[PDB]
Design a protein around this ligand. Structure first.
Ligand SMILES: *[C@@H]1O[C@H](CO)[C@@H](O[C@@H]2O[C@H](CO)[C@@H](O)[C@H](O)[C@H]2NC(C)=O)[C@H](O)[C@H]1NC(C)=O
Ligand SMILES: *[C@@H]1O[C@H](CO)[C@@H](O[C@@H]2O[C@H](CO)[C@@H](O)[C@H](O)[C@H]2NC(C)=O)[C@H](O)[C@H]1NC(C)=O
Ligand SMILES: *[C@@H]1O[C@H](CO)[C@@H](O[C@@H]2O[C@H](CO)[C@@H](O)[C@H](O)[C@H]2NC(C)=O)[C@H](O)[C@H]1NC(C)=O
Ligand SMILES: *[C@@H]1O[C@H](CO)[C@@H](O)[C@H](O)[C@H]1NC(C)=O
Ligand SMILES: *[C@@H]1C[C@@H](O)[C@@H](O)[C@@H](CO)O1
Ligand SMILES: [Ca+2]
Length: 640
């Protein structure tokens, strides 16, 4: 009926901010080669204050060379004694975010680790100090090379923590002058981190935040008892239609109301990875076409604004938040300076399901809500009003509300699938840029000679690595192949996902069905070495081991194979070829209907080999194991 908002008996918890994740894995891959001005516009919609999503927090993967959901991300230490703080795109992204919002909060978290840290095992806790050394390197490099202060460091994404590791990490951070960096643990479930903190005083002192994933708006008693800040450090992960926007809206409010969580962080920041990779289009917005410039300011962007434009980390929740009589919820926050923000959500069940967890039915129906401002809020006479309706009307500023009759009270008619933000703040804005170009499929003729002497990013555009890591490579000692693309892992990472046994990078249009792929290849390992080119590759990311298609392999022992699968279990054709290590060969693979052919140096090696049809997927290149190999003069022409 009536809902009292009041600060006379004190405040609720401090609000820590809303954010999103770039990484786990390569979710920002296709954003880097957007042409201007579109790249900058996308970044504004994400990070520019009083504009779009206006995010408070950016969390990024600390790349570990392993597959981490939609690709691999490059590590700062591929090998022992290797350090490089200019690989990948997270450095660039953090700097772009910081340029727009100097007060943005930055977080790092590893999903995978380079294999050498395991000292013979696929386990990062074999040598605690070595693993902590590696992670602290990353934080120091952020500061020294990019002028970035990392605010929070995590442990091992959705994988076991080791209490001694966490203690060693704190000790090493302090030793390296990073006392200001805080620790969040364990980026998995509420247990066992929560009970561990109650039983171990030394662990309790070193953990600043309990970060739990997909908590379904609830926490657990042990986490409440800890007295630590509680964050949903990975949530959302739902297609960014109106359904996803509804999920985001509902959990933004109710994570605090139901679970005492004062930060929620969406996976992922922006969908800039091929949509047919796992969890396609599950970012706050969509930018999956750098070749066209087409992007989509999806509804979750405006859902974010309803909170982010009108709150900041350091504000406090009131004690007076809760559910509405007929469904939906309200939170309220102040800044201790006289401002007040009220965020109301009435998300229907059928239009707000997150993928994790699925909620049993709950009813939402038309209702009236009367709010009465008691305490210091009574004095307020005026409120700006922002309104969104999902299904569609986004972030529309309505007529100001006047509180004149001394009552300190007001009333609203609420329907379903609505958001209202009522705030004293006058700074709100629905940021706008002209529409970007229409969507267009990946170019049906595409080439890359990798001839770039000082590349802005460490890898050629559009190549999305799914196992292994591929990089621009310069070889001064060669003229024709001075600039190539090289696979650089020489051992399997400490994996997070189930990486393939062969390295692979995919590119192009998953819809492609008939296609001709060509590439110069160079095998660096004598006798045992092998490489391939491929087409119709149908799966990647967390499922890269499942990939089928047509794979044309050549080996340094003078053999070739054509397979139906990346794992090489199924043979379409096999035979001998004049192929050795350390020599450049040109491979061609043509696929049309039921039949494929392969060329070696422009000469037919096999033809009219029967393959599964229909079938469709990306073009790809790769190596037999985790081994050095180079590629040059890539080309594909295709039809869908
Ligand atoms: C966590 O939030 C819960 C609410 O979800 C708080 O628990 C109580 O909530 C009921 C209604 O659900 C209120 O009537 C009580 O006033 C709340 N208790 C107290 C002591 O305020 C709880 O406060 C929060 N836990 C904390 C802050 O540790
Ligand atoms: C609401 O919040 C705004 C934003 O901080 C407050 O305005 C600022 O007040 C500080 C002093 O506390 C000044 O140094 C800033 O220059 C002000 N900024 C702007 C944009 O005005 C404001 O005082 C708060 N209270 C009310 C009633 O608006
Ligand atoms: C890919 O190639 C196959 C084989 O050439 C095409 O399938 C043929 O299409 C023609 C004309 O549409 C038909 O007359 C044939 O009977 C089809 N053959 C088979 C085996 O189905 C297919 O249309 C091509 N697809 C694209 C997108 O180019
Ligand atoms: C939801 O609640 C309203 C009012 O109580 C009721 O009329 C309606 O039938 C309910 N819907 C369902 C599916 O129970
Ligand atoms: C959290 C980790 C991230 O990389 C994704 O795998 C996501 C999928 O829902 O879960
Ligand atoms: Ca070249």
């Amino acid at each position: 009926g009536a809902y009292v908002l009041d600060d006379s008996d004190g405040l609720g918890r401090e609000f820590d901010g809303i954010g999103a994740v770039s990484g786990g894995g390569a979710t920002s891959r296709l954003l880097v080669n957007y042409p201007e001005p579109y790249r900058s516009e996308i970044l504004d919609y994400l990070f520019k204050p009083n504009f779009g999503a206006s995010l408070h927090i950016l969390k990024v993967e600390i790349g570990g060379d392993g597959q981490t959901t939609d690709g691999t991300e490059p590590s700062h230490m591929h090998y022992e004694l290797d350090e490089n703080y200019f690989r990948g795109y997270e450095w660039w992204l953090m700097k772009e975010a910081k340029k727009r919002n100097p007060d943005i909060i930055l977080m790092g978290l590893p999903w995978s680790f380079p294999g050498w840290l395991g000292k013979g095992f696929s386990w990062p806790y074999v040598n605690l100090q070595l693993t902590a050394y590696y992670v602290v390197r990353w934080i120091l490099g952020a500061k020294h090379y990019h002028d970035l202060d990392i605010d929070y460091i995590g442990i091992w994404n959705e994988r076991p923590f080791d209490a001694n590791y966490i203690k060693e990490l704190r000790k090493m951070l302090d030793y390296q002058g990073l006392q200001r960096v805080r620790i969040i643990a364990s980026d998995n479930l509420w247990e066992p981190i929560s009970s561990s903190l109650l039983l171990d005083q030394e662990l309790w002192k070193v953990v600043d935040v309990i970060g739990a994933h997909y908590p379904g708006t609830y926490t657990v008693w042990n986490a409440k008892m800890s007295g630590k800040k509680l964050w949903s450090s990975e949530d959302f992960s739902t297609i960014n239609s109106n359904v996803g926007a509804g999920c985001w809206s509902r959990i933004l409010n109710q994570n605090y109301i139901n679970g005492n969580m004062t930060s929620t962080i969406a996976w992922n920041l922006v969908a800039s990875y091929y949509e047919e990779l796992p969890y396609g289009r599950s970012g706050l917005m969509t930018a999956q076409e750098p070749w066209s410039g087409h992007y989509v300011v999806a509804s979750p962007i405006w859902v974010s604004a309803h909170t982010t434009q009108f709150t900041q980390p350091g504000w406090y929740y009131l004690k007076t938040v809760g559910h509405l009589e007929k469904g939906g919820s309200y939170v309220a926050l102040t800044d201790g300076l006289g401002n007040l923000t009220i965020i109301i959500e009435t998300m229907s069940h059928q239009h707000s399901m997150c993928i994790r967890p699925y909620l049993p039915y709950y009813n939402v129906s038309h209702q009236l809500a009367t709010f009465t401002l008691k305490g210091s809020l009574r004095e307020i006479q005026e409120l700006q009003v922002w309104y969104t309706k999902l299904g569609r009307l986004h972030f529309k500023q309505l007529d100001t509300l006047w509180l004149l009759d001394g009552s300190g009270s007001f009333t609203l008619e609420l329907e379903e699938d609505e958001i209202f933000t009522l705030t004293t703040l006058t700074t709100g804005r629905k940021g706008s840029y002209p529409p970007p170009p229409s969507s267009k499929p990946f170019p049906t003729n595409y080439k890359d000679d990798f001839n770039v002497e000082y590349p802005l990013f460490s890898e050629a555009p559009n190549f999305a690595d799914q196992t292994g890591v591929f990089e621009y490579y310069m070889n001064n000692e060669d003229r024709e192949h001075r600039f190539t693309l090289r696979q650089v892992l020489n051992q399997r990472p400490i994996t997070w996902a189930a990486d393939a046994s062969s390295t692979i990078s995919v590119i192009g249009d998953h819809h492609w069905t008939n296609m001709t792929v060509q590439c110069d290849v160079y095998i660096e390992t004598p006798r045992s070495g092998g490489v391939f080119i491929a087409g119709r590759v149908n799966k990647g990311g967390i499922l890269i081991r499942s990939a089928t298609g047509v794979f044309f392999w050549i080996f340094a022992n003078g053999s070739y194979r054509v397979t139906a699968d990346l794992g090489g279990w199924i043979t379409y054709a096999s035979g001998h070829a004049d192929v050795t290590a350390k020599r450049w060969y040109t491979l061609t693979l043509g696929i049309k209907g039921y039949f494929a052919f392969g060329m070696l140096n422009g000469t037919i090696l096999w033809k009219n080999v029967r393959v599964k049809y229909p079938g469709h997927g990306w073009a790809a290149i790769g190596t037999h194991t985790f081994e050095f190999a180079q590629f040059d003069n890539f080309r594909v022409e295709a039809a869908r």
